[PDB]
Structure formats: structure tokens, C-alpha cells
């Protein structure tokens, strides 16, 4: 099956998922000098006060923190979006070394990790319907750079020992995702895709300009997770990122100048 190894990684995915060579694939390199400032873009509205986290899961390719999305509890509105998008989960992509790990790049610069806060358009009723629509998902992407520790991330870091292998989950209640946001909500936006199979072209990407800083010790703990299940030979969960894809006939817009 697909993964991030030499024999099943991103350069192989097109054989099972031909959309991998499609017209709206993610991630992309953000060329800051060719992005277009769009004064019609609205500020983002992030309403995470009533977020209800439920569980953290190692799914074999990343770890997901899952939220209750049965009501409009934690929503994203505004920006380039029409309507209301509910938060369903967040996860990260990261590297084996501090100089790689992000999926998006900025003027070819790679960050140590990238956080994806995943939201779905409530007009489609459920997440599975939303992924079939061109405006179904909105993903907030936040870059991580290695520096000072991020206090709001430590609760995530400390539970990773309990979900070391694929298929393990743990209860993870009362986590506030507001502690993961940067000070500024300036962003770039473009239409794209999931970055993992099935690579569906259903995502409005909103990539924040300002990275958050995490400490070396925090990111080191991400690198101790395993791709494998318990009892199988150990494969460290590192470099779970897809390289940049061609922009094709797309324009990246900026909310700032």
C-alpha cells in the first residue's frame, strides 16, 4: 500500500491514484514575488472557543487529533471561503532533519514541519460528501520552525508515547487548538488537493505567513513515532511529506502586501 518509503512513496502514488498528475495538486512552492495581493480577501474568522477534542490516533502515516464535528463548535469562516467550515482534525507532517519536513515551501525554503487544521464545508452534510466537491474542505497550514518551545504543543508531545505504533489511540479531551496559532493571521490561498492518497482536488488551502516556533526537543518526539504496527519491525515515522507539485493554471493570492 502507499506510504513514504523508497518503494511506495510519492513518486509511485500515480499508479494507484492517477489524479496525482492532476491540474490542482498540492503542495506547491509559494513564490512570494509572484503571489497577487487581493484586497477583496477578507480576514480569517477562527472561532475555536467551543472546540471539543476527543482522541489522538496514530493512523500509520501521521497522528491525528480528532474533534467533535457534530455541531458548529469550532468553525472557520471568512477569508476566501463562502459559508461555514467545521474543524474535524489536525495533524502534522515533519522531517528526519530540521531543514525539511514541510509540504509547502516559501521561495523554496522548507520548514521543519507543517500543521494542517482540516475543516469541511457544512453545506455538504458530512465529511465524506465534502471531499467529493471542489469547495469541500478548507485546510489551514501553519509552518513550524525550530527555536523556542511552544507551550501549547506540549500536551500533544507528552501523549505520543501512548500512540507509538499504527492503530493505537488515546483519549485526548479538553485540548485547545488556539494555542497552536501564530500572532498574525496573514495568509496565502490557492485551490489544491489532499496531499495524501486519494489526493482529491477538494481543498481551499489557507497557508499562514507567520510560522510558529517549537523546540528541538518537541520535534524530536515526533520522530520517535512508528509507521509500523506493534510487533512489526520498527520504521520511524519521519519524512511523511509530499514534495511540491506544479502550479499549472493557478494563481496564489495573498491577503497582505
Q: What are the residues binding ligand SHH (CB under 6 A)?
A: 116, 118, 131, 139, 194-196, 198
198: preceding bond cis by omega (within 30 degrees): yes
| Strand 105-106 versus strand 29-30 pairing type | parallel
Binding at 115: pick from Zn ion, ligand SHH, none (beta carbon under 5-8 Å per type): none
Binding at 118: pick from ligand SHH, Zn ion, none (beta carbon under 5-8 Å per type): ligand SHH
3-state secondary structure of 183: coil
Determine whether 1 is an active site residue.
no
Q: Of 215 and 223, which has the nearer Cβ to ligand SHH?
A: 223
C-alpha cell at 20: 496525482
Q: Does 242 bind Zn ion (CB under 5 A)?
A: no
Q: Of 116 and 119, which has the nearer Cβ to Zn ion?
A: 116
Instruction: Please tell me whether 12 is known to bind a ligand.
Output: no
Rounded Cα distance between 200 and 179, Å, is 29
Q: Among 28, 10, 34, which Cα is nearest to 246's?
A: 28
CB atoms within 10 A of CB 55: 15
Shortest Cβ distance from residue 151 to ligand SHH (Å)? 25
Q: Which positions from 102 through 141 interact with Zn ion, judged by CB under 5 A?
A: 116
Shortest Cβ distance from residue 198 to ligand SHH (Å)? 5
Q: Do residues 120 and 130 make contact, with C-beta atoms less than 8 angstroms apart?
A: yes
Shortest Cβ distance from residue 77 to ligand SHH (Å)? 19
Instruction: Please tell me whether 52 is known to bind a ligand.
Output: no
CA dihedral (70, 47, 90, 41) in degrees, to 10, reads 120
Which residues fall in the annotated binding site for substrate?
195-196
Residues classed as catalytic? 61
Amino acid at each position: 500500500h502507499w506510504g513514504y518509503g523508497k518503494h511506495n512513496g510519492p513518486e509511485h502514488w500515480h499508479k494507484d491514484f492517477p489524479i496525482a498528475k492532476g491540474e490542482r495538486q498540492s503542495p506547491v512552492d509559494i513564490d512570494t514575488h509572484t503571489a497577487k495581493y487581493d484586497p477583496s480577501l477578507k480576514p480569517l474568522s477562527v472561532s475555536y472557543d467551543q472546540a471539543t477534542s476527543l482522541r489522538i490516533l496514530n493512523n500509520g502515516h501521521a497522528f491525528n487529533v480528532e474533534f467533535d464535528d457534530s455541531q458548529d463548535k469550532a468553525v472557520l469562516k471568512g477569508g476566501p471561503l463562502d459559508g461555514t467550515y467545521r474543524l474535524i482534525q489536525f495533524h502534522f507532517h515533519w522531517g528526519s532533519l530540521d531543514g525539511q519536513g514541510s509540504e509547502h515551501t516559501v521561495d523554496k525554503k522548507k520548514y521543519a514541519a507543517e500543521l494542517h487544521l482540516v475543516h469541511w464545508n457544512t453545506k455538504y452534510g458530512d465529511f465524506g460528501k465534502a471531499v467529493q466537491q471542489p469547495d469541500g474542505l478548507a485546510v489551514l497550514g501553519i509552518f513550524l520552525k525550530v527555536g523556542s518551545a511552544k507551550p501549547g504543543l506540549q500536551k500533544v508531545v507528552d501523549v505520543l508515547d501512548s500512540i507509538k505504533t499504527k492503530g493505537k489511540s488515546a483519549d485526548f479531551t479538553n485540548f485547545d487548538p488556539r494555542g497552536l496559532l501564530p500572532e498574525s493571521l496573514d495568509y496565502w490561498t490557492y485551490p489544491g488537493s489532499l496531499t495524501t492518497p486519494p489526493l482529491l482536488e477538494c481543498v481551499t488551502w489557507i497557508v499562514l505567513k507567520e510560522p510558529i516556533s517549537v523546540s528541538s526537543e518537541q520535534v524530536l518526539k515526533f520522530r520517535k513515532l512508528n509507521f509500523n504496527g506493534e510487533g512489526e519491525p520498527e520504521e520511524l515515522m519521519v519524512d511523511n511529506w509530499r514534495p511540491a507539485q506544479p502550479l499549472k493554471n493557478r494563481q496564489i493570492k495573498a491577503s497582505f502586501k
